[PDB]
DNA sequence: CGCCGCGTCAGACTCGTAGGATTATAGCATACGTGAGGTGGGATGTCAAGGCCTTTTTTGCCTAAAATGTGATCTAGATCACATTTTA
């Protein structure tokens, strides 16, 4: 299939790596779905330090709460990972989409579900643990991705302490160091962005 | 029977236009009723304060009882210039 009537009527467009995708501030007049590749949300405070708050790969959809009040700002940023290719079509176009056949807003609702769900083991998983526990599993989380390779002993996985820190945010430093404290007690390995982990599977 | 005289009876249809009448007629007195006017007066209608009950607004109050304060003792985060070191 049905999606096929959907992008069939949509308009398509590329864009390359560490584009600025949607600005924050910007007016709700357009929505975007993820064709192909990666994306990465975040956020930015009057102190300018940047919070990654979440990263979705291929199949989601993009610009969501702005649909339906007219005139939404931005609530947050979203920057491209690697580069990526998207379609992209305005709302005054998806009423008649609504209107016509509802099962477009199922998959949003469904995928906004799990979306929420998931910002609610954020903000707990946040509140309470320690630094190693949040920065644990979150560990196992992104472990779960289909970006992440296959080892072995487990699975693998890219990324600098830089970005790490800025999902469970604090320093980079710092979590060099807990990376030593798991590296003594024998559940990890890595050479410099290039982390191997053991226990998956 | 068959005139002749007299009389009776119809004379198309829808619209428009104007305002409109006239003569002369006695006079005064009696006496009675009805119209336009007063007039107190039941009686109705109004407007401002008081006694029955319930509801509402303050307001007692009743005890569970969770909350709001006391402050010295910590803790697990958080930094910054130098020394590399990794990755597209
Ligand atoms: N909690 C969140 N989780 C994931 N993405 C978000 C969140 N908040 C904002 N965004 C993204 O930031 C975008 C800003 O504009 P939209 O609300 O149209 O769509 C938003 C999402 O793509």
């Given at each position: 299939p049905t999606l096929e009537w959907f992008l069939s009527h949509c308009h398509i467009h590329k864009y390359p790596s560490k584009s600025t995708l949607?600005?924050?501030?910007?007016?709700?007049?357009?929505?975007?779905?993820?064709?192909?590749?990666s994306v990465?949300?975040?956020?930015?405070?009057?102190?300018g330090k940047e919070?990654?708050?979440?990263?979705?790969?291929?199949?989601?959809?993009?610009?969501?709460?702005?649909?339906?009040?007219?005139?939404?700002?931005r609530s947050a940023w979203v920057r491209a990972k690697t580069?990526?290719?998207?379609?992209?079509?305005?709302?005054?176009?998806?009423?008649?989409?609504?209107?016509?056949?509802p099962d477009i807003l199922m998959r949003l609702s469904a995928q906004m579900a799990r979306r929420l769900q998931v910002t609610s083991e954020?903000?707990?998983?946040?509140?309470?643990?320690?630094?190693?526990?949040?920065?644990?599993?979150?560990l196992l989380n992104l472990a779960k991705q289909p970006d992440a390779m296959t080892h072995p002993d487990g699975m693998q996985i890219k990324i600098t302490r830089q970005e790490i820190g800025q999902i469970v945010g604090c320093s980079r430093e710092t979590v060099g160091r807990i990376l030593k404290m798991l590296e003594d007690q024998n559940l990890i390995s890595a050479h410099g962005k290039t982390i191997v982990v053991y226990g998956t599977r």
């Amino acid at each position: 299939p049905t999606l096929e009537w959907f992008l069939s009527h949509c308009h398509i467009h590329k864009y390359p790596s560490k584009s600025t995708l949607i600005h924050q501030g910007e007016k709700a007049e357009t929505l975007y779905y993820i064709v192909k590749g990666s994306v990465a949300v975040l956020i930015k405070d009057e102190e300018g330090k940047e919070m990654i708050l979440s990263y979705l790969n291929q199949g989601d959809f993009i610009g969501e709460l702005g649909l339906f009040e007219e005139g939404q700002e931005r609530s947050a940023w979203v920057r491209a990972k690697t580069a990526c290719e998207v379609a992209e079509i305005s709302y005054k176009k998806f009423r008649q989409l609504i209107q016509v056949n509802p099962d477009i807003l199922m998959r949003l609702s469904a995928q906004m579900a799990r979306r929420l769900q998931v910002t609610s083991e954020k903000v707990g998983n946040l509140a309470f643990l320690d630094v190693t526990g949040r920065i644990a599993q979150t560990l196992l989380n992104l472990a779960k991705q289909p970006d992440a390779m296959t080892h072995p002993d487990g699975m693998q996985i890219k990324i600098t302490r830089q970005e790490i820190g800025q999902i469970v945010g604090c320093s980079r430093e710092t979590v060099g160091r807990i990376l030593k404290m798991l590296e003594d007690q024998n559940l990890i390995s890595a050479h410099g962005k290039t982390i191997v982990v053991y226990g998956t599977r």
